[PDB]
Amino acid sequence: AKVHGSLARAGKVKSQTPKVEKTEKPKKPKGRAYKRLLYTRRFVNVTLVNGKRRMNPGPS
C-alpha cells in the first residue's frame, strides 16, 4: 500500500479550529472539601428524578 502520499496537510484541522480562550470560573475546592461537594450534590439535597437521574444533562 502507498507509503509516499502527501504530507502537506499535517496539522490541518487543529490549525484552523477557531480559538476560544478559557473562561474564568469559580475555583473548585480540593481534596476532602470536593468530596463533600460531591456528597451533598449526589445524595443529600439531590436534584432531579425525571425518569431516573442525570449527571451531565443538557437541555431536557
Binding site: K35, R36, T40, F43
Partner: protein, 185 residues
C-alpha cells in the same frame, strides 16, 4: 551493608474499577465520616480484609486449639479495646462478620464530632490537623487516630490554642491590635 529498613503498604485497590453501586456506596462513606480519599476507605477494608482472613484461618482449627485460643482471644481483645467489637459478640464469629463502618465510627475524626465539640465532621478535620483537641496533655493531629475507647473520656481541647484557653491566636490578636491603635493612642 545495613539492616533493610522494612515496610509494607496499608491499602488495597478495587478489582472492577467502575461499578456504580460501589462508587455510590464509597462516596457515602466519605460523606458521613469526613474522608478526603477513596483510599481512606480502601485502607480500612484492607485492614478488615486481613482481620477476616486471620479469623477465617483460626475458625477452621479445632475449638480449644492452643493457637486458636492464643491468637483468637488476642485479636478479640484488641478489637474490643478499640471499641469495634461489641462486648457480647466477643467470641469472634462477629469479627468474622463485622463491616467497614464499625471501624470508621471509631476514628478520632468522628469521636471529636460524636460528643459535640465539632458539629459537622468536616469541622472535625480542620480542628484535628490544626493542633487543637488533645487526648492526654498530648496533642494529636491525625484524623485517623482510632479512639481507643478508654481514651474517649479524655478528648477535650488542648492546654494550648483557643477553645482550651491560654491564648486567642494571631488572627484575633491582630484585631485586638487595631482597636487600641485606631480608637486608642
Amino acid at each position: 551493608p545495613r539492616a533493610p529498613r522494612t515496610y509494607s503498604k496499608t491499602y488495597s485497590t478495587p478489582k472492577r474499577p467502575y461499578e456504580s453501586s460501589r462508587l455510590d456506596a464509597e462516596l457515602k462513606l466519605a460523606g458521613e465520616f469526613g474522608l478526603k480519599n477513596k483510599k481512606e476507605i480502601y485502607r480500612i477494608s484492607f485492614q478488615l480484609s486481613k482481620i477476616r482472613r486471620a479469623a477465617r484461618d483460626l475458625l477452621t482449627r479445632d475449638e480449644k486449639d492452643p493457637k486458636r485460643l492464643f491468637e483468637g482471644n488476642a485479636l478479640i481483645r484488641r478489637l474490643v479495646r478499640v471499641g469495634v467489637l461489641s462486648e457480647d459478640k466477643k467470641k469472634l464469629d462477629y469479627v468474622l462478620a463485622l463491616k467497614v463502618e464499625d471501624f470508621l465510627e471509631r476514628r478520632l475524626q468522628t469521636q471529636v464530632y460524636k460528643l459535640g465539640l465539632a458539629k459537622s465532621v468536616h469541622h472535625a478535620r480542620v480542628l484535628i490537623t490544626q493542633r487543637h483537641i488533645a487526648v492526654g496533655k498530648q496533642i494529636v493531629n491525625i484524623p485517623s487516630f482510632m479512639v481507643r475507647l478508654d481514651s474517649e473520656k479524655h478528648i477535650d481541647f488542648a492546654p494550648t490554642s483557643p477553645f482550651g484557653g491560654a491564648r486567642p491566636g494571631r488572627v484575633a490578636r491582630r484585631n485586638a491590635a487595631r482597636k487600641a491603635e485606631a480608637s486608642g493612642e
